[PDB]
Design brief:
Chain C: Heterotetramer that consists of two anti-parallel arranged heterodimers, each one formed by a 18 kDa (Caspase-6 subunit p18) and a 11 kDa (Caspase-6 subunit p11) subunit. The complex is a heterotetramer, with 2 copies of chain A and 2 copies of chain B. By secondary structure, chain A is α/β, with parallel strands linked by helices. Chain A has one domain: 3-Layer(aba) Sandwich (Rossmann fold), CATH 3.40.50. In chain A, 25% of the residues lie in helices and 24% in strands. In chain A, a hairpin with a 4-residue loop joins strand 5 and strand 6. Chain B has one domain: Alpha-Beta Plaits. A two-stranded antiparallel sheet of chain B has the order 1-2. Chain B is globular and about 35 Å long. Classes of the chains: A alpha/beta, B alpha+beta. Chains in contact: A-B, A-C, B-C, B-D, C-D.
């Protein structure tokens, strides 16, 4: 049983790199604009895509859209991917991030990839990157 | 804190970007396809403390992770 | 959970009479590799060791360099 | 700026390993015994010694005793030491651990070793192992 052991990274595709980038907000949230966020989004796109991720961005999605998107990405087979990456660039309160619309608890989002719900990432790295 | 086995959570805590992401990105570009990923994230902790914030990461990773090219 | 108070903090979190899964596996690993591996490498071995028992521990790093405990 | 860089680990002393071991609790807190915790305590003690740590154990401190003890070690020079380890073996609750008496916020204990409060550990590792609820 091997201390040097490394994840299998020999699959067909690297995997998906979801970015959720939020710049402006439903104005009754009263949250300031996040000015540099698109620079961040593009810079993340460049680097991850350079590591062979399939990068997929979404700008200013509302909670429902955000959810059914991430729900989709977690209901597609990752059978033939090395790992999964998911970035949230937004405002954050407690264990919540904000879509355009309302806040969503981060356990809700990650839970969609825990093993009992997402078979095909079992044993594979699931990387989340949160700039709240 | 991560949801389960093999989750890794990276946390951060001006129109050109956040200190955290510019530095995560620079390190990804330089060292991302050769260094173990937590090693790289640690470099990012260092690079962000040098700015005159400390980011951090929470690993439930069970093995070493590299992004060697395909 | 609490997350590192600042630069160069590492937090290590766990979650019968001979002890607890986490400390046992943490200790076995220190005794076997503490003196040679990088500490987080080592902790990562603790994560794997524990997740096979039948819980996942976790560690949160604000470390800024590689940490080793070579004999002094 | 060197990706292979290691914390300097060549000081006279490795440093202190502090273990707070809590087994039984003030009756009125109505919390059960932690039946394996002493095994855990000795097991860390043995390991951390082999790695050169000066292991200081305290069992079932009341909150006052706990806070003054950890404040004491936060205020000794660690100028000669590689790093600092601190372990809590108790029950947990939100972001608190139990002493024998009462719950204490973890931040309150970790903050004692931030840079502005413990100059002699700046740049050295400060390691916390928490085994709680």
């Amino acid at each position: 049983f091997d201390p040097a052991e490394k994840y299998k990274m020999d699959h067909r595709r690297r995997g998906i790199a979801l970015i959720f980038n939020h710049e402006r907000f439903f104005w009754h949230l009263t949250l300031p604009e996040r000015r540099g966020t698109c620079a961040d989004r593009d810079n993340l796109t460049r680097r991850f895509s350079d590591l062979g991720f399939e990068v997929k961005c979404f700008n200013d999605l509302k909670a429902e859209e955000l959810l059914l998107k991430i729900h989709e990405v977690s209901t597609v087979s990752h059978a033939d991917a090395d790992c999964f990456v998911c970035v949230f660039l937004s405002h954050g309160e407690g264990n919540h991030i904000y879509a355009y619309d309302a806040k969503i608890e981060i356990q809700t989002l990650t839970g969609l990839f825990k093993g009992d719900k997402c078979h095909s990432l079992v044993g594979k790295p699931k990387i989340f990157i949160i700039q709240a | 804190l991560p949801a389960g086995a093999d989750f890794l959570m990276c946390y951060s805590v001006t129109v050109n970007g956040s200190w955290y992401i510019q530095d995560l990105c620079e390190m990804l570009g330089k060292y991302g396809s050769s260094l173990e990923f937590t090693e790289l994230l640690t470099l990012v902790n260092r690079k962000v403390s040098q700015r005159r914030q400390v980011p951090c990461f929470a690993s439930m990773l069970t093995k070493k992770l590299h992004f060697f090219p395909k």
